[PDB]
Amino acid sequence: MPAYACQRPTPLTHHNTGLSEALEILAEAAGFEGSEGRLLTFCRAASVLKALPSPVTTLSQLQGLPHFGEHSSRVVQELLEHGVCEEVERVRRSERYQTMKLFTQIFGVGVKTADRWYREGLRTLDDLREQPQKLTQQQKAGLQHHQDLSTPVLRSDVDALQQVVEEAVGQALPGATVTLTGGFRRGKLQGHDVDFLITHPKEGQEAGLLPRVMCRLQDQGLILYHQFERSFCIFRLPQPGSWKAVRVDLVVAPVSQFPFALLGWTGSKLFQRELRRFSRKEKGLWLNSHGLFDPEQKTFFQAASEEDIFRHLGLEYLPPEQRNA
DNA sequence: CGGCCTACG
DNA sequence: CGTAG
DNA sequence: GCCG
Ligand SMILES: [Mn+2]
Ligand SMILES: [Mn+2]
Ligand SMILES: [Mn+2]
Ligand SMILES: [Mn+2]
Ligand SMILES: [Mn+2]
Ligand SMILES: [Mn+2]
Ligand SMILES: [Mn+2]
Ligand SMILES: [Mn+2]
Ligand SMILES: [Mn+2]
Ligand code: NA
């Protein structure tokens, strides 16, 4: 088992859901308490279990696995022996965990904001709504549309959204393209949002595109919230006789950067953090959604495909459906 | 000991 | 700070 | 929390 998540395939369907979900609770709780390092270890340990070929049945099967130490091993041991882990159950039932989960799921609210509200005694969405001057415009939109945004986005929604985005993009710039990214490109059947990457084959023609696309969508009445090259939107998606709010991310990249943007925006989140860590720590190259930089030569790697990027980092290529770390 | 991804809005 | 994967 |  390789130590970095970008070194191993991780399929969407795997064999250790119970164990990985428990470790991910502890990771989320670590985040709520402000420990990104513990969050990362628990995330990495959960991800190792997703890459295994079979269910873990006995603690022996963990020996030698990366990111399993005393704490993560004890969690698995309790789950294997007893079906539950006392620490996980205590976290699950705590008012702090439940409220932090409730607040951070709001679009516009992260851990630091949620933690302040918790310390101020707030506990419910109705508490937040009763104090609206304490909200940014982004948070007001997230709260306004919270019910819809909690409803899974389905493939039929993706297809309808891709059609309307393609229509606006084509009106704004002939020849521009729209690529579905995010979890749906990795094969997920559902999601919390839909992610799209927009480019044009002639370098530079995409300058100024995203404001033109947004203007065209807003004039068709499709935009409930927005506000460049990244737009984190809420769309008014038509449904039979009605509509529902859906989170949509729109990203524009020049074609020179498209493989890097496609790689970054396809995820998973852990896969990309691990890939960027690997690049810098193991290869001495700096990776982001714009490029891959050699800081000694002060040059950027020219990539035509995601495969090119994997090759330049010395990694076996993984298709999107194996990046579900 | 000290790192832990790296951007844009 | 929030967002993103 | 784990590891370089
Ligand atoms: Mn399998
Ligand atoms: Mn411990
Ligand atoms: Mn026991
Ligand atoms: Mn997404
Ligand atoms: Mn998104
Ligand atoms: Mn840019
Ligand atoms: Mn330390
Ligand atoms: Mn994400
Ligand atoms: Mn520690
Ligand atoms: Na949030």
Question: Are A226 and A272 contained in the same domain?
Answer: no
- Nearest nucleic acid nucleotide to A71, CA to C1' distance: D1
Question: Are A26 and A86 contained in the same domain?
Answer: yes
Question: Are A84 and A62 contained in the same domain?
Answer: yes
Active site residue A157: no
Question: Are A235 and A265 contained in the same domain?
Answer: no
Helix or strand run (H / E) with residue A206: none
- Token digits for A268? 């998973």
Q: Near ion ligand 3, which residues have CB within 5 Å?
A: A 81
Question: Are A195 and A245 contained in the same domain?
Answer: yes
Rounded to whole angstroms, the Cα distance separating A89 from A92 reads: 5
Question: Are A147 and A162 contained in the same domain?
Answer: no
How was this structure determined? It was done by: X-ray
Kindly determine whether the C-beta of residue A320 is less than 7 Å away from any atom of nucleic acid strand C.
Answer: no
Using DSSP, state whether A237 is helix, strand or coil: strand
Kindly determine whether the C-beta of residue A67 is less than 7 Å away from any atom of nucleic acid strand D.
Answer: yes
Question: Are A161 and A236 contained in the same domain?
Answer: yes
* Residue (of A244, A224, A220) closest to A234 by Cα position: A224
How many structural domains comprise chain A? 4
Kindly determine whether the C-beta of residue A91 is less than 7 Å away from any atom of nucleic acid strand D.
Answer: no
Domain end, chosen from A213, A238, A255, is at A255
- Nearest nucleic acid nucleotide to A232, CA to C1' distance: C3
Question: Are A147 and A228 contained in the same domain?
Answer: no
Question: Are A15 and A82 contained in the same domain?
Answer: yes
Q: Which residues pair with A247 in a beta bridge?
A: A234
Rounded to whole angstroms, the Cα distance separating A27 from A273 reads: 15
Resolution (angstroms) equals 1.6
Question: Are A42 and A137 contained in the same domain?
Answer: no
Owning domain of residue A159: 152-255
A63: alpha, beta or left, given left = phi > 0 and alpha = psi -120 to 50?
A: beta
Rounded to whole angstroms, the Cα distance separating A89 from A22 reads: 9
Question: Are A59 and A133 contained in the same domain?
Answer: no
Chain D nucleotides near the protein (CB, 7 A): 1-4
* Residue (of A219, A212, A207, A159) closest to A184 by Cα position: A159
Residue A249, annotated as binding a ligand = yes
Instruction: Using alpha carbons, list the distances in angstroms from residue A219 to A127, A140, A196, A238.
Output: 34, 22, 20, 15
Using DSSP, state whether A106 is helix, strand or coil: coil
Is residue A149 a contact partner of residue A230, using CB atoms and an 8 Å limit? no
Question: Are A143 and A170 contained in the same domain?
Answer: no
